[PDB]
Each structure stands twice: as C-alpha cells, then as structure tokens.
C-alpha cells in the first residue's frame, strides 16, 4: 500500500528499495513566437532514482533529443521514466535489484507497473509523503551535469556524501529532505545559508559542504527558520 507518516521507518530497513521522482524529466521554457503565439523549448531533464538507506542516486539524464518528433510529451515523460527505471533494474545484479519501488507521483504507477511486468515480486508503491525531490536541480553539481549533457547519460552519486560514517540513514534522509524543502521554498535564501562561510568547502567528490556535527546543527536550524518564515511570508499566518 501507500508509504505514509505511519510506515516511514520501513525506508531504512534492509529490504532494498528505490524512490523514483519524475518531476524533472520533461522541462521546458515557455516563450512568445514572432507571430505572438506561445511555444515551449525543452531543456535537459533527469530521473531522480534514490536508495534512501545507502544514499545511492541513479541520475538518468534525459537529453532533449528524446522528445524530437514526439506528441503528448507530458504523457510520454511518464512512460520514458518507467522504461529507464525498468532498464536500470535489469542492469543490476539480482541481489541488488529493489524489492519495492516508491513513486513520488501517483501518475507513475501504471507506466512503471506495465514496464515492470517481468518483475512480479517487485512492489510498485505510491506515497502520501509530499517529498521535495523536485528541488534536486537546486544542487549545483546535479544541475551542471544535466545541463552539460550532449547525449543520454547515467551519472551515479551518493546524495548523503560521507554522512553515514557519522549518522543513521534515518537522520541522513531527514537532513536531505530538510535541505531540499528549504531549496524548494526559497532557493536563494537556502543557497546563501549553505555557502556563506567561505572556509567550509564542498569536496570535489561531494555535493554538500563539509560541515562539522556542530555546524550541521546550526545549518539545520537556519533551514527550519527559513521554511517557517516563508510559510508566514506566504500564508498571512
């Protein structure tokens, strides 16, 4: 059934699972034509496929060439997402294949179920969680590899850097979703909080800055304050 606030802890057990978010697969800029009509121009996208226990991210870059001469692209985007996830599962050794795949958007369920018919024992699940994985393209190094792609490409990352040396998967996922929620609500403010002490750098092999345990607590505080501010800056509450 649906992944929710009640069965959250299941994300960090020893059954292999992946989250799949399709919100950055089909990306456009909307513009005026010479005649004053409106048109879209596609830009490179990505599937965000994440093991929440290990932090392993399978970032499948979706090059604009995929869309050439195709109709109903927002519908096609779901099927192409399901095709690439099913190709990723088939590419993994049997002992690495997920037992469950959780889709962040209910519209992915039928496309993924139909592409995964060869895998009847892999459970395809929706979630009642409102996860901020749309903000993945606010992580500079992920945005950079997507925009620079000249052809279809899979890039592998650990979205937790080295955090699992010091904290549990539960806590790392909580840190990740807080960072992404802040980046989603006020990107400029979030980026400023992360990159305001020049002495704290991002290692070449990392996505996020090299914060000490104490600095992560301060950062996490600043992110929460930003999310509440913006919720009052917003809602007139």
């Amino acid at each position: 059934g649906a992944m929710n606030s009640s069965n959250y802890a299941e994300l960090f057990n020893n059954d292999i699972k992946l989250f799949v978010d399709d919100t950055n697969v089909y990306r456009v800029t909307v513009h005026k034509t010479f005649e004053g009509n409106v048109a879209t121009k596609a830009i490179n996208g990505c599937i965000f496929t994440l093991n929440p226990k290990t932090g392993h991210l399978f970032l499948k870059i979706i090059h604009t060439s995929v869309w050439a001469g195709q109709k109903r692209l927002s519908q096609l985007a779901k099927w192409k997402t399901a095709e690439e996830v099913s190709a990723l599962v088939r590419s993994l050794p049997k002992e690495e294949q997920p037992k469950q795949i959780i889709v962040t958007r209910k519209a992915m369920l039928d496309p993924l179920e139909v592409h995964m018919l060869d895998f009847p024992n892999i459970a395809i699940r929706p979630t009642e969680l409102r996860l901020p994985f749309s903000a993945a393209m606010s992580i500079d190094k992920l945005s950079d590899v997507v925009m620079k792609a000249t052809e279809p490409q899979m890039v592998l990352f650990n979205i937790y850097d080295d955090w699992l040396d010091r904290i549990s998967s539960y806590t790392a996922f909580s840190r990740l979703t807080l960072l992404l929620r802040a980046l989603k609500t006020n990107e400029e403010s979030a980026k400023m909080i992360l990159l305001s002490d020049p002495t704290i750098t991002i290692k070449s092999y990392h996505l996020w800055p090299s914060f000490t345990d104490e600095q992560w607590i301060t950062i996490e505080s600043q992110m929460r304050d930003l999310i509440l501010t913006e919720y009052g800056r917003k809602y007139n509450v």
Partner: protein, 300 residues
C-alpha cells in the same frame, strides 16, 4: 415450439424463462412452460420465496434433447434433467397440455428482444465456460466465481470466461508498453480475436452470455467480464466497422432490458463514462449513448 415440463412445484418460487417471470405457490398445480421458440438458447431460473440467496438456473437448447424440471427435496432445488425416452416425454407433455397446467412462453410477435440479447450465444460455447460434460444444459447461480476471480476456490463450479487483464504480459508486447497500454488494438485483434476467440461472433457470444448471467443471477464476476470485454473494444483505436456497428446494437438491447432499479449495482460508472465520452470509440456507439443518456443520466 418446445416444452419443458415440471414434475411438480412443491415450494413457492418465482420462475423466470428468459426475460419473463411468474410467481408459483407451494403445491400449485404448475407443470411447465410450452411454446418455447426453437433456434435460440434459453435460460429457466428460480428464486425461492423463502430464501432469495437461492437464485439459480439452467441454460439449454431444446434442439439438443428433451429437458424437464423436478424439485429435489434433499438438495432443496429445482433441477433440470434430460428424458432419453422420447415417447414417455411426448406422452407427459401431451397430458399436461391437455389439462392446461402449462404457462405459454409469452412472446409478442413484433418483439426481437430475446434474439437481440442471444444473437451470438451458442450452447456449445456455454458448455465450455460452464463445465459439466455429462449434461447438455448448464447450471449457473448468484455465487459462482470466475477463473479470474479465483486466481486473485472450487475449480469444478467456476465460470471459465476468457481471462482479460490490461496489465499482463498477454496484453502488452515487450518494447510496446505505452503503445499497447494506451491503444489495446493488438490485444483485441491479434491475441483475443485471431488467437483465442477465432472470430468476433464468439467474442460477442461470451460478452452477451456474461451480461445475461449478471442480469438474471446478479453474478458479480459475470458483470466484471461483460465490462472488461466492452472496455477492451472501446480502448482499441483499430476495430472493424462491422464490429463497432454490431457492438452498438448489442449494448443498446442490454441497456434497454436492464431493470431500471438495478443500474446502481450492474453498471460500472468508470467503464461507461470512459467508453462513451473518453475512449477511441466515444463517437461509434450512437444508439447505446442515446439510450444510456435518456435512461441512466445519473450514472454518467
């Protein structure tokens, strides 16, 4: 004009013959149904006055043998049986007719309703869906489950409808996932029509039989099968013109015949809304769309 005599009517019961029905009282001197039109399958069905769970009946064709009904006080139901002695049977039917203890199949001459509901239905196809090879007639009731329902518990008492599943390897060619899911033409035309049914007449025969079992027995699995076979046609972009024209007639007579008060439990909102308003065939069922809009505008 054939006859199905009744030995007796020891318990109060509503007896149906096709779309007609009449109430018989406990020990009423009722001895059967005469003037049954040759050339069609028929169904004789029962609902006991004391217990509406007992809702059941027999598909038969009088061209295949001499059939009669006899109440079994052990099994507590009206049973169909074949009389192999032609002369004994002719003599039973002649006596009961002489004493006018038989109801007459009450067909209006202008009225093609039963032909229209059973046009493609053949007794040899019924006997493959309902397996009891020692009898030439077929027992169905309210509670019998389909092979499909039993996959998702007694195989001998099942309805062997053709399994239709839109999210199956049977329905979806490897490499044509989106195409086959959004346009079911390959599944309809290659797998089901050419592959399994062999022709449209056998497909329509199963569809019509599923409807009739849903209507006469409130058989839920039958209703599921009727809707799946409609949806498979309506969800196909490529259907022969003759099949669409025939489907519109078939559904028109089914919707016309359905009791007004059973639309809520026998009609699936999603399937009908999709078939008439969203599907490839949204504009190919003119008669069905008009009767549905005039008779069941709430459902839509």
């Amino acid at each position: 004009m054939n006859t199905v005599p009744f030995t007796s009517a020891p318990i109060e019961v509503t007896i149906g013959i096709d779309q007609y029905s009449f109430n018989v009282k406990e020990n009423q001197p009722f001895h059967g149904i005469k003037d049954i039109p040759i050339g069609h399958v028929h169904v004789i069905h029962f609902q006991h006055a004391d217990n509406s769970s007992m809702r059941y009946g027999y598909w038969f064709d009088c061209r295949m043998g001499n059939f009669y009904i006899q109440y079994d006080p052990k099994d507590g139901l009206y049973k169909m049986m074949e009389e192999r002695d032609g002369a004994k049977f002719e003599n039973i039917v002649h006596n009961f007719k002489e004493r006018q203890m038989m109801v007459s199949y009450p067909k209006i001459d202008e009225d093609d309703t039963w032909y229209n509901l059973t046009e493609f239905v053949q007794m040899d196809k019924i006997r493959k869906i309902v397996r009891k090879d020692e009898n030439q007639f077929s027992y169905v009731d309210s509670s019998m489950t389909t092979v499909q329902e039993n996959e998702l518990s007694d195989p001998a008492h099942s309805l062997n409808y053709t399994v239709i599943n839109f999210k199956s390897r049977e329905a979806i060619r490897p490499g044509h996932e989106m195409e086959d899911f959004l346009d079911k033409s390959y599944y309809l035309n290659t797998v089901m029509l050419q592959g399994i049914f062999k022709n449209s007449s056998n497909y329509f025969g199963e569809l019509q039989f599923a409807f009739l079992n849903a209507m006469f027995f409130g058989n839920y699995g039958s209703s599921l099968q009727w809707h799946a076979m409609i949806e498979l046609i309506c969800s196909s972009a490529t259907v022969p013109k003759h099949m669409l024209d025939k489907l519109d007639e078939i559904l028109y007579y089914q919707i016309k015949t359905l009791p007004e008060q059973y639309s809520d439990i026998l009609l699936n909102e999603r399937v009908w809304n999709i078939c008439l308003y969203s599907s490839f065939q949204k504009n190919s069922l003119h008669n069905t769309e008009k009767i549905m809009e005039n008779k069941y505008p709430e459902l839509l």
